[PDB]
Each structure stands twice: as C-alpha cells, then as structure tokens.
Write a protein that binds this ligand. Structure first.
Ligand code: NA
Ligand code: NA
Ligand code: NA
Ligand code: NA
Ligand code: NA
Ligand code: NA
Length: 275
C-alpha cells in the first residue's frame, strides 16, 4: 500500500525519512553495521529489491554496489532516483583517484546546499511515483531545507567573526571537499593519504615531512588517526589535525544527517577560531 523506497548511504535515509515521514517506507539496501568498502551483498539483500518501488541513488561513485544489486534482482528495471542530477560536481584528484579511474568526488552530501538540491530532486521524483502524497513530500522537503539552511547560516555567521588568513587550510585527502568549499575554506595543498589509520614509521615520516613543509596550521584529515599518531604529527610538524564524520557509521535515523553535520560544522568553526 505505502511506497517502499530503497536507500544506499546513511545521508539518503535522513533525506528520504524527512521528505516522506510516515507516508512511505524507507528501506536500507545493505544492513546497519556494514560499510560497502568492502562488504559483499547477500542473496537476502538482493531479494529485498524485489519488494521495493524505487531506489534513491547517490549515483556519482558513492554507491556503485546498489546498481550491481539492482541488476542481479527480480526488478532490474526498478525506478531509480538520481539524487545528484542538479548538483555541480567536484573532481576527484590525486594518485589514488587517478589510479582508480575516479573522475568525480561523490561526497556531495557533506555540503548543505548540495543536500538541499538532492532533497528537492528526491521529493519531486517521489511525487511523480506517488501523486497522492506529492503535496506532503514537497511541504516536508521545504521544512527540511529550512532547517538545513539555518545550520549553514549559523556556521557561516560564526566564521564571519574570523580573519581571511585563518581560512588558509590543507587536507589529507579530498573527502570533505564539498564542505570546505561551501564554508569558504581555501585548501593550500592536498596531502595524499598514505598507509591508513595506523601507518608504518616510514609512511608516517613522509606525511610529517609533507606537513612541516606547509604554511598552514589547520589540517582536515580524511584519515582518522588514533590519538598517539595525532600527538606525534602535531608535535613533529606544528600543525593541528582535525577529523570530520563521513556520516557512514551505525544506525540509520532521520536525524543522523543533521546531528552529524552540526558537529562537523562545530569542528570546522573550532579549528578556524583556534587558529
Ligand atoms: Na568512494
Ligand atoms: Na532515472
Ligand atoms: Na576519498
Ligand atoms: Na622511519
Ligand atoms: Na586536534
Ligand atoms: Na531502519
């Protein structure tokens, strides 16, 4: 009776939940506790696609697993929502991105303005599939966007207090590229991620060497290093390492996206205010 909407990544559960409310069912494609980098979808997950009416996709490199799961299902021609259709995309850069054939950065969801565009795109397409609830989906998308804009405005107001020189930062990877660009942060250099969260002494040395060579004091890292590594990096290079949430862990909830974006924007503001 109610429309059954498939979702891939955690932010899309928040988007769809806030758009539909109780009027439709929001169905995660892959279970909570599992990251699709790497996790192999079960027959149970593929069978579930046969119970859905539409699948919302990031569709720009964030959820390639979803298109493969759909092709193997009982509904390969199921309606799909390309959430990023109207979102201007950022290039994926570095040795790793080039070596993987990655053209675009898919983390559009870490931008508030991009999330608003995706929410409006989902709400429009959902109403085409379920005309009876089209008015409600639009009204909910408007209320959701309003809350999201207030979050963007609040962070932008707190950064307005800070001088333009403080906005010169650097990164380890490009995971937060859409967020940093949106909040007017100038990325001086991008240090290529080497060796994971627990790098070898040789891999850590190379990172510290690349960091001390920089003229910035704040670094946003894609790699969430344990405190001992952070402590060593900071003491040996004089930079301050900050990590943000990629909104990809634990339970699916309607509030997850906004709760974690609030915190990410708190870290960015704290980083610049402390510099
Ligand atoms: Na990716
Ligand atoms: Na489509
Ligand atoms: Na990345
Ligand atoms: Na060494
Ligand atoms: Na720190
Ligand atoms: Na759930």
């Amino acid at each position: 009776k109610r429309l059954r909407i498939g979702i891939t990544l955690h932010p899309y559960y928040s988007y769809v939940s806030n758009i539909v409310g109780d009027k439709a069912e929001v169905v995660p494609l892959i279970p909570a506790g599992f990251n699709p980098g790497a996790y192999e979808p079960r027959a149970e997950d593929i069978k579930r696609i046969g119970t859905l009416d539409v699948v919302v996709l990031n569709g720009v490199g964030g959820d390639d697993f979803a298109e493969r799961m759909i092709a193997s299902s009982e509904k390969p021609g199921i309606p799909v929502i390309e959430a990023n259709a109207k979102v201007p995309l950022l290039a994926a850069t570095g040795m790793a991105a080039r070596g993987a054939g990655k053209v675009v950065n898919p983390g559009t969801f870490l931008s508030i303005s991009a999330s608003i565009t995706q929410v409006n795109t989902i709400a429009r397409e959902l109403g085409k599939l379920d005309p009876a609830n089209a008015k409600a989906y639009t009204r909910n998308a408007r209320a959701y966007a309003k809350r999201l804009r207030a979050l963007r405005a609040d962070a932008l107001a707190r950064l307005n207090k800070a001088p333009a020189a403080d906005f010169r930062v650097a990164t380890i990877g490009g995971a937060y590229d859409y967020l940093l660009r949106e909040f007017g942060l100038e990325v001086t250099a991008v240090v290529e991620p080497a060796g994971g969260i627990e790098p070898s002494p040789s891999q850590l040395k190379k990172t510290i060497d690349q960091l001390k060579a920089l003229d910035v004091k704040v670094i946003f890292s894609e790699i969430d290093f344990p405190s001992t590594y952070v402590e060593t990096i900071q003491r040996e290079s004089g930079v301050k390492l900050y990590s943000l949430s990629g909104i990809s862990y634990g339970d699916y909830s309607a509030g997850k996206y906004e709760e974690e974006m609030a915190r990410n924007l708190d870290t960015v503001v704290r980083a610049i205010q402390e510099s």
